Amino acid sequence: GQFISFMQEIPTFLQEALNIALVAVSLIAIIAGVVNLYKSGLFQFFVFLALAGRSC
Amino acid sequence: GQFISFMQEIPTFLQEALNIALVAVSLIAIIAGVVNLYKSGLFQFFVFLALAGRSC
Amino acid sequence: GQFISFMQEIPTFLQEALNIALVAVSLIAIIAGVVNLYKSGLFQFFVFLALAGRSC
Amino acid sequence: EAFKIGLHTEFQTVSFSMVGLFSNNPHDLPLLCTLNKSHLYIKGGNASFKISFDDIAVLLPEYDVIIQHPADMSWCSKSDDQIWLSQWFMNAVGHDWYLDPPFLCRNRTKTEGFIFQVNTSKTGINENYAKKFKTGMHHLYREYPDSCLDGKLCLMKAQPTSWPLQCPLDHVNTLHFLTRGKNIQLPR
Amino acid sequence: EAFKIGLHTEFQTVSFSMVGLFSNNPHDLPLLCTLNKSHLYIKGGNASFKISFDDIAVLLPEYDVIIQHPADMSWCSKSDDQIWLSQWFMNAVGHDWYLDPPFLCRNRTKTEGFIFQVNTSKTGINENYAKKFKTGMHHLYREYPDSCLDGKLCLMKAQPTSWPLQCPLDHVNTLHFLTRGKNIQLPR
Amino acid sequence: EAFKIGLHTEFQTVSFSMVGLFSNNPHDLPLLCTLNKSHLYIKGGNASFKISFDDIAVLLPEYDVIIQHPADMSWCSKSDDQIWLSQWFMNAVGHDWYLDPPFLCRNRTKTEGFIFQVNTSKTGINENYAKKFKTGMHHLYREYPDSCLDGKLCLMKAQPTSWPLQCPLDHVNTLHFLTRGKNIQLPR
Amino acid sequence: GYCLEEWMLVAAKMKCFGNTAVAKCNLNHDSEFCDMLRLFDYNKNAIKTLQTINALISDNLLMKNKIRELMSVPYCNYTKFWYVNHTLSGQHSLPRCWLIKNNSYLNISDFRNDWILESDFLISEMLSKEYSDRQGKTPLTLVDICFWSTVFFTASLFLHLVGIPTHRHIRGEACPLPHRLNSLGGCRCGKYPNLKKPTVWRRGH
Amino acid sequence: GYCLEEWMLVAAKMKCFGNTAVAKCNLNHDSEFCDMLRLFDYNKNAIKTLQTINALISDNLLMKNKIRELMSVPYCNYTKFWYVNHTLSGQHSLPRCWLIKNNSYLNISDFRNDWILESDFLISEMLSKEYSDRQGKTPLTLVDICFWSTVFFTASLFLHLVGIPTHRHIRGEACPLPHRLNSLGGCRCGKYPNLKKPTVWRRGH
Amino acid sequence: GYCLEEWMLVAAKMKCFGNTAVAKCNLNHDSEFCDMLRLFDYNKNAIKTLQTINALISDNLLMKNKIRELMSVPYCNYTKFWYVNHTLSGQHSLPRCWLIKNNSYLNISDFRNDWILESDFLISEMLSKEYSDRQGKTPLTLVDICFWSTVFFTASLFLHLVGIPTHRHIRGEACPLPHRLNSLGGCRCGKYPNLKKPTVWRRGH
Ligand SMILES: *[C@@H]1O[C@H](CO)[C@@H](O[C@@H]2O[C@H](CO)[C@@H](O)[C@H](O)[C@H]2NC(C)=O)[C@H](O)[C@H]1NC(C)=O
Ligand SMILES: *[C@@H]1O[C@H](CO)[C@@H](O[C@@H]2O[C@H](CO)[C@@H](O)[C@H](O)[C@H]2NC(C)=O)[C@H](O)[C@H]1NC(C)=O
Ligand SMILES: *[C@@H]1O[C@H](CO)[C@@H](O[C@@H]2O[C@H](CO)[C@@H](O)[C@H](O)[C@H]2NC(C)=O)[C@H](O)[C@H]1NC(C)=O
Ligand SMILES: *[C@@H]1O[C@H](CO)[C@@H](O[C@@H]2O[C@H](CO)[C@@H](O)[C@H](O)[C@H]2NC(C)=O)[C@H](O)[C@H]1NC(C)=O
Ligand SMILES: *[C@@H]1O[C@H](CO)[C@@H](O[C@@H]2O[C@H](CO)[C@@H](O)[C@H](O)[C@H]2NC(C)=O)[C@H](O)[C@H]1NC(C)=O
Ligand SMILES: *[C@@H]1O[C@H](CO)[C@@H](O[C@@H]2O[C@H](CO)[C@@H](O)[C@H](O)[C@H]2NC(C)=O)[C@H](O)[C@H]1NC(C)=O
Ligand SMILES: *[C@@H]1O[C@H](CO)[C@@H](O[C@@H]2O[C@H](CO)[C@@H](O)[C@H](O)[C@H]2NC(C)=O)[C@H](O)[C@H]1NC(C)=O
Ligand SMILES: *[C@@H]1O[C@H](CO)[C@@H](O[C@@H]2O[C@H](CO)[C@@H](O)[C@H](O)[C@H]2NC(C)=O)[C@H](O)[C@H]1NC(C)=O
Ligand SMILES: *[C@@H]1O[C@H](CO)[C@@H](O[C@@H]2O[C@H](CO)[C@@H](O)[C@H](O)[C@H]2NC(C)=O)[C@H](O)[C@H]1NC(C)=O
Ligand SMILES: *[C@@H]1O[C@H](CO)[C@@H](O)[C@H](O)[C@H]1NC(C)=O
Ligand SMILES: *[C@@H]1O[C@H](CO)[C@@H](O)[C@H](O)[C@H]1NC(C)=O
Ligand SMILES: *[C@@H]1O[C@H](CO)[C@@H](O)[C@H](O)[C@H]1NC(C)=O
Ligand SMILES: *[C@@H]1O[C@H](CO)[C@@H](O)[C@H](O)[C@H]1NC(C)=O
Ligand SMILES: *[C@@H]1O[C@H](CO)[C@@H](O)[C@H](O)[C@H]1NC(C)=O
Ligand SMILES: *[C@@H]1O[C@H](CO)[C@@H](O)[C@H](O)[C@H]1NC(C)=O
Ligand SMILES: *[C@@H]1O[C@H](CO)[C@@H](O)[C@H](O)[C@H]1NC(C)=O
Ligand SMILES: [Zn+2]
Ligand SMILES: [Zn+2]
Ligand SMILES: [Zn+2]
Ligand SMILES: [Zn+2]
Ligand SMILES: [Zn+2]
């Protein structure tokens, strides 16, 4: 939806300090969420559920 | 306050995805806050303060 | 920036409950961030990096 | 009618009373009502006319009073209020007293009533004046039933009559009359 | 006076100067001033009158100039500026030169000054004209001291007089005069 | 010309055609256009005049018609459209039929065309009328080539002439003409 | 005309309107209801207390209605007005004229779109007014400060969980504390000199 | 005139404008483009279908343009209009007159500032429109509830990490549980008499 | 207009006004101060440089003031104006007229409510201006992305603390890994048969 238009219009937004700060915070938050979901074990849980006894 | 009036207008608000998402996030956040306050020991501390040496 | 002008208008803002709540939450968040950065070891890491073998 | 259109949202109506506005008013506002069709009336102050359009010519230019200035109406009716209402009706229609053809009227001394006649025909040299008269009458009366056809002669007569209490009370007509009246000195 | 009303918000005032506004001007805006009460003055060009409402009748219809057209004021004053000011004052009050009763004016040849007198009496056939004149005078002059009582005859005289330097410098009066003056030509 | 000014932002232009504004209209709208300078034209209905300003006086008041009322133009030309266009042009230039000096017109029987002449000279008593005429001409014509110098004689003449097909088609002139013409009756 | 008395309304009652709706009359000059409010306010104000009639009504709007009835399209005759009302809070839209066409009131089905859009706009205006009232009291800088403090605190919790290494150990080698190591794992004391060995960044003990 | 046919434009093409831009025509009466739209809408409406011309054109704009012409300052001929258009989204600003001076179209360097500011204002208007559409659709109270719920949850995580003591202990002593202690360090059961010893709070075992 | 000279004011000073307050004059047709600014700007422009006087002032407002004078209610004689000025910021309100009654200026106590409301509106206008300036530069989508990223990261920390179970165990039974279990409690390798034993979730060791 609005994500495609936002993707097209990003070059105009990256001229204010606040917009760059928001982009950096969003990227860092997503990366950290991925890494600590991996550390928690959710990915391992789904991988094991996919291999529900079908391998060892 | 505004919560009482907001209570009556909820059926009008649950027509957009964002409002449902906000309600869900608020409920999940409140539930998680309660469960990890229970895990932390705040409720146990309050109970102990209530039972300040009055029982065993 | 805007902070130096905002500091001059503080007594006018602290007449609504929400503004007081925001100030209190900001101060508590900053204090808690400082204390758990100290617990994390970032300050200790910086101190060690400054004392990179120069003392014991 | 009142009915619900949302959850807490209801359609509602308000209606304004016109008799209250007219009667409660300090000044004496003119009244203009169109009963049935081609049966126009007017009432201002005490005088109450009945505007009538017909092909006959009750008053002839050479045997009656020719009005080219408002002061020449003093030979029309003894009542000053009738003269005042006629003058301001002609002003509201759009009758320029210097650039428009004169209109006839009955002699005050003659005891056949107060009648004044305007040539509203769209024939020959009387093209622009009758169109202006039609413009004014559409402004004054809501849904004006025009009867003066193109080419054919059509002459207006205004005679005193009893005001019909059955005719509807309209305030848009009064608003247009006041707007077109320029500097009208309404009675208190 | 300036005073604080909040932590930093301060009540402050700005006042416009009118001497500067009239001094610096592409044109010669008319002046309308009311010294004390019942003493009305007017200034435009080199002419400056003193409007006075009295029960006396200095000018009579059968001895002085009857003015029904603006061009008839040639027999009123040698100075054209006085005629200009009188004409535009009468236009500003609301004197329609075709539908209003004529007003008297002294013969130019007679060496008794320039005086023109307008019948502003609220009696009989002059009622509407006097009401229009009162409307105009309320427009032109704020805090207008009306002295023309109902029934009693009231006639104004406008004669040249020295402009009172002690009279204030109101500009709303000039604004109303210019608004009502239509296409007035102000000398540079 | 269209050109880009931002990342996704483009400067763009739109133009209105005016032949499709005039040729494609229900009513017949007055045309006011100029060739070069001091070559004014006008077109309404069928009549098409050429406004010309010059020192010489084609028509003298002693020998020709005097027009102080619009009805006196019946002695000007056989064509009623010419009379209509002349009357409405004179209304648009701000001529008051009661407070302004009369203008001449060639006798209809005198077989040297239809010419009406207006004393627009800014000299002496005619000063205010000339200035008002200048104001009207500036309204009607955009970039009006004034030639009536102060003091010197300047009398306008309006002769019928072939409408120049190579003349720019303006519309602001028509808008001003309609605004100033008040209650004009445009032929359909 | 914030409130209206009984003699002004058919089925005489004391129907009084809100503040925002009647405040929209000052800015707007294209509303028949506002014109009739001005007319009736003039009428009641000067009945005994204290071109007023034509300065009270908008001549442009009256002329527009006249042209519309001459075009035989729906128009207004300044009699009946319809408005959309939120029953609970009492907020309502500025009343619109019940348009007339061919000397008959238009049926509800003709301006169904009109009153649906009016209800939607009323709800949107209520929510937008709440947002504007918030923005007129709470400064933006304080909101930004709170948001950035919360973000900083959350990142601080993350650093608390992961844990930032403090000293500099050596693969297999135990804790030299207290004895600091350089980029090569050395020191001036000579206890653990520059042996050029891989270093283990292990957290606080 | 939401759309415009070919005969109304110099180029023989059809150009249609957006609703948001032309919605300013009803509110603004200081724009020549709106007057031209009204005039041409009347002309196209009444060609065969169905002081109108002077009520369609703002007399104030004509008077101001005529005065500007008499002052020899740039004015509008009501012929050519320029506007700033966002190519991707299609949103555009309300067209402004290409002013003329000395009977010639001005060059694009004279009103460079005008169209640069117009483009910036168009971008700001689109972003503000997104914000306004959000604010009229999502209640502020729900946003506040979500924000405070998130803050409470984050504080709850912090309390989870730090831990809150649940009972009372004493330095160099085992756990008194399941026997509680008072402020002095002993309850009334007699197993732990009140020794007034200092107590050290400890978390759950 | 935007600025005033010494001869324009009663006291000879260089008082000079702001931008937004005088920009409100273009939109507002009901203000004596804006009409006086138009008149004085016209005079200062036409003194040597380059119905104007009556088309420079609003006839409706002047007529309204005349009617108010006739009604003997407070009116404005276009000489003195008051405004509320934020001293530090310099941002002020549009100067309203100091109304007159009995040929004397009204005392401050009569419009105390007026200027208190003016000060409150000025504070609210400054805060709302800051919010609108923020909304015209920062896209709403980026704010939403940041908020949802922060919510996702907080949920991620919560899941990190709690710990999601990774495999299947049996009450009082060893760790089956690297041999996985099905719903019944044993895969098809034959080492762990389908004994239909209940399974208890445990996290990674
Ligand atoms: C009303 O006006 C019409 C049109 O001007 C008059 O009728 C015309 O009069 C002239 C002059 O006598 C004749 O040449 C025309 O043939 C007449 N036209 C018609 C259709 O009759 C008419 O006489 C006027 N009526 C009054 C009462 O004066
Ligand atoms: C506006 O038009 C409507 C519809 O014609 C008029 O409504 C009528 O009002 C009268 C008086 O209350 C009722 O008896 C009728 O039943 C109404 N309906 C119709 C269809 O006639 C209304 O009066 C008009 N307003 C004015 C001021 O004339
Ligand atoms: C000013 O106007 C009044 C109008 O009333 C004139 O006075 C009346 O004139 C008529 C003339 O026929 C007399 O019949 C009345 O008796 C007069 N007086 C009244 C009615 O009060 C007055 O003469 C006019 N003055 C001048 C100088 O013309
Ligand atoms: C508006 O009215 C006020 C109050 O009457 C006038 O203020 C006076 O101005 C003069 C000249 O500056 C001062 O000497 C007076 O002291 C002021 N106050 C009073 C109470 O008279 C003001 O001049 C009027 N404005 C106009 C244009 O007439
Ligand atoms: C046009 O008007 C001018 C000015 O009124 C007339 O010229 C003057 O007319 C008087 C009276 O005949 C002469 O005494 C003057 O010598 C004329 N000269 C000037 C320049 O003022 C002029 O005659 C008028 N033209 C027509 C055709 O009537
Ligand atoms: C919208 O509807 C509400 C609810 O019916 C109206 O509020 C009522 O107003 C009347 C007087 O007009 C009071 O007697 C009732 O007690 C009110 N009810 C409530 C629940 O407050 C409101 O006036 C309506 N809005 C209008 C008519 O504009
Ligand atoms: C602004 O520019 C855009 C891009 O050229 C125009 O949108 C195009 O319009 C044409 C003609 O109707 C269509 O064929 C294209 O598909 C449109 N593109 C997009 C992306 O919508 C738009 O019309 C212009 N706006 C104006 C001229 O007002
Ligand atoms: C308004 O004025 C401009 C110039 O100020 C006119 O633009 C000219 O238009 C013609 C016809 O298309 C072109 O041939 C010229 O090259 C244009 N530019 C010039 C003369 O500099 C425009 O036509 C005018 N519009 C109207 C309706 O009169
Ligand atoms: C509001 O008050 C401030 C502060 O007094 C005014 O700003 C002053 O403007 C004058 C103009 O001559 C400068 O000399 C001062 O230095 C300014 N002060 C500061 C602190 O900047 C501002 O002009 C006032 N606004 C008005 C009068 O409209
Ligand atoms: C008829 O009217 C005139 C005035 O128009 C009047 O002089 C005359 O007296 C009246 N007729 C008779 C017979 O009296
Ligand atoms: C008196 O005025 C008239 C104009 O109304 C004028 O004709 C006449 O000459 C003047 N009187 C004398 C004695 O000259
Ligand atoms: C000149 O005009 C008059 C009317 O103004 C007319 O009577 C006369 O016939 C015309 N010319 C002649 C031939 O005398
Ligand atoms: C208007 O309503 C009348 C009611 O009598 C009807 O006869 C007429 O056909 C209608 N006109 C239309 C629908 O154009
Ligand atoms: C004005 O325009 C003309 C052409 O219309 C051009 O030649 C000239 O240079 C311009 N400037 C002046 C001062 O004439
Ligand atoms: C006006 O713009 C054009 C664009 O091509 C440029 O060539 C020209 O030099 C500019 N101005 C002038 C008249 O120098
Ligand atoms: C109004 O002003 C007059 C001026 O003379 C004064 O006497 C009077 O007391 C004031 N107040 C009233 C209510 O008339
Ligand atoms: Zn270590
Ligand atoms: Zn060491
Ligand atoms: Zn314990
Ligand atoms: Zn396991
Ligand atoms: Zn297996």
Please say whether the beta carbons of F14 and F4 come within 8 A.
no
Residue G33 is encoded by which pair of tokens? 């209801």
What does chain I look like in DSSP terms, one character per residue?
--B--GGGBSS----B--SHHHHHHHH-SS-HHHHHHHHHHHHHHHSS---HHHHHS-HHHHHHHHHHHHTTS-B--SSEEEEEEETTT--BPPPEE--EETTEEPPTTTSHHHHHHHHHHHHHHHHHHHHHHHHTTS-HHHHHHHHHHHHHHHHHHHHHHH----EEE-TT----TTS---SSS--TTSSS-------EEE---
- Residues in F 63-82 with any Cβ partner in E closer than 8 A: none
Cα angle value G26/G28/G34 (rounded, 5°): 70
Residue H25 is assigned to a ligand binding site: no
- Angle between helices D128-140 and D172-180 in degrees, nearest 10: 140
User: Which residue has the least CA distance to atom 2 on ligand 6?
Assistant: G87
**Neighbouring C-beta atoms of residue E158, cutoff 10 Å:** 23
Please say whether the beta carbons of G57 and H52 come within 8 A.
no
Q: Which residues of A touch I159 (CB under 8 A)?
A: 36-37, 40, 42
Omega of the bond leading into I178 within 30 degrees of 0 (cis): yes
What does I73-128 look like in DSSP terms, one character per residue?
S-B--SSEEEEEEETTT--BPPPEE--EETTEEPPTTTSHHHHHHHHHHHHHHHHH
Cα distance between residue D72 and residue D162, in whole Å: 26
Distance (Å) from CA F155 to ligand 5 centroid: 10
If you ran DSSP here, which 8-state letter would residue G6 be given? Answer: G
Q: Which residues of G touch A32 (CB under 8 A)?
A: 158
Question: Does F187 map to a domain?
Answer: no
Distance (Å) from CA H102 to ligand 14 centroid: 6
Closest Cβ–Cβ partner in E98, E183, E185 for F98: E98
Cα distance between residue G186 and residue A56, in whole Å: 47
Q: Which fold has domain I140-202?
A: Rubrerythrin, domain 2 (2.20.28)
Per DSSP, the three-state class of D64 is: coil
In ligand 2, which atom is closest to the CA atom of G79?
25
Distances (CA, A) of B34 to B48, B49, H153, H162, I171: 18, 19, 8, 16, 29
Helix, strand and coil content of chain F, in percent to the nearest 5, comes to 25, 25, 50
Q: Which range marks the domain in which residue E131 is found?
A: 21-180
Please say whether the beta carbons of F124 and F2 come within 8 A.
no
**Neighbouring C-beta atoms of residue I135, cutoff 10 Å:** 22
Cα distance between residue E102 and residue E66, in whole Å: 6
The response to whether residue H87 sits with its C-beta less than 6 Å from ligand 7 reads: yes
Q: Which residues of F touch D99 (CB under 8 A)?
A: 69-70, 97
Cα distance between residue F42 and residue G130, in whole Å: 60
Q: How many domains does chain E have?
A: 1
Number of the ligand closest to the Cα of G97: 2
Nearest CA among G149, G138, G194 for reference residue G168: G194
Give the CA-trace dihedral at I117, I122, I124, I125, to 10 degrees: 130
* Chains H+G touching (3+ CB pairs under 8 Å): yes
Q: Show the ligand 11 pocket: residues with CB < 6 angstroms.
A: E 65, 75, 107, 109
Whether chain D has a CB inside 8 Å of the CB on E124: the answer is no
Best of A9, A10, A40 to substitute, by most chain H Cβ atoms within 10 angstroms, is A9
In ligand 10, which atom is closest to the CA atom of D72?
5
Helix, strand and coil content of chain E, in percent to the nearest 5, comes to 30, 25, 50
Across chain I, which distance is largest between two alpha carbons, in Å? 110
Cα distance between residue B24 and residue C15, in whole Å: 32
Residue at token pair 């009977």: H103
Cα distance between residue I61 and residue I76, in whole Å: 10
What does H140-193 look like in DSSP terms, one character per residue?
HHHHHHHHHHHHHHHHHHHHHHH----EEE-TT----TTS---SSS--SSSSS-
Closest Cβ–Cβ partner in D98, D99, D128 for F185: D128
Q: What is the CA radius of gyration of chain H?
A: 37
* Chains A+E touching (3+ CB pairs under 8 Å): no
Cα distance between residue I98 and residue E13, in whole Å: 9
Distance (Å) from CA H79 to ligand 10 centroid: 62
Cα distance between residue I1 and residue I21, in whole Å: 11
- Residues in I 22-81 with any Cβ partner in G closer than 8 A: 30, 60, 63-64, 67, 71-73
Residue I187 is assigned to a ligand binding site: yes
Amino acid at H175: C
Whether chain A has a CB inside 8 Å of the CB on I180: the answer is yes
Residue H92 is assigned to a ligand binding site: no
Whether chain F has a CB inside 8 Å of the CB on A5: the answer is no
Separation of CA B11 from chain center: 21
Q: Which residues of H touch B14 (CB under 8 A)?
A: none
Q: Which residues of E touch F135 (CB under 8 A)?
A: 183
Nearest CA among F37, F36, F39, F55 for reference residue F149: F55
Across the A/I interface, how many CB contacts are shorter than 8 Å? 95
Q: Are strands D47-54 and H200-202 parallel, antiparallel or unpaired?
A: unpaired
Question: In chain H, what are the domain boundaries?
Answer: 3-135, 140-202
User: Which residue has the least CA distance to atom 12 on ligand 12?
Assistant: F109
Number of the ligand closest to the Cα of D67: 10
Q: Is G22 exposed, middle or buried (0-12, 13-18, 19+ CB in 10 A)?
A: middle
Tell me the structure's resolution in angstroms, rounded to a single decimal: 3.0
Cα distance between residue I133 and residue G139, in whole Å: 13
Whether chain C has a CB inside 8 Å of the CB on H159: the answer is no
Residue I169 is assigned to a ligand binding site: yes
I88 with C12: Cβ contact below 8 A:
no
Give the CA-trace dihedral at A20, A26, A29, A30, to 10 degrees: -130
* Chains G+C touching (3+ CB pairs under 8 Å): yes
Separation of CA A29 from chain center: 8
- Angle between helices E80-93 and E127-140 in degrees, nearest 10: 110
For residue I147, what is the nearest residue in chain H, using CA coordinates? H147
Q: Nearest CA of chain A to the CA of G86: how many Å?
A: 32
Residue H179 is assigned to a ligand binding site: yes
For residue G147, what is the nearest residue in chain A, using CA coordinates? A22
User: Which residue has the least CA distance to atom 20 on ligand 1?
Assistant: D153
The response to whether residue H91 sits with its C-beta less than 6 Å from ligand 7 reads: no
Closest Cβ–Cβ partner in H153, H180, H187 for B29: H153
Nearest CA among F154, F181, F168, F128 for reference residue F31: F168
Nearest CA among F184, H88, H66, H2 for reference residue D127: F184
Cα distance between residue D116 and residue G8, in whole Å: 38
Cα distance between residue H68 and residue D41, in whole Å: 50
Binding-site annotation, residues of B for Zn(2+): 56
Please say whether the beta carbons of D160 and D47 come within 8 A.
yes
Please say whether the beta carbons of F68 and F102 come within 8 A.
yes
Nearest CA among E36, E39, E44 for reference residue E54: E39
**Neighbouring C-beta atoms of residue I194, cutoff 10 Å:** 14
Please say whether the beta carbons of H21 and H122 come within 8 A.
no
Residue H102 is encoded by which pair of tokens? 């000395």
Q: Nearest CA of chain E to the CA of F80: how many Å?
A: 28
Separation of CA I188 from chain center: 66
Whether chain G has a CB inside 8 Å of the CB on B8: the answer is yes
Question: Does F11 map to a domain?
Answer: no
Please say whether the beta carbons of B33 and B43 come within 8 A.
no
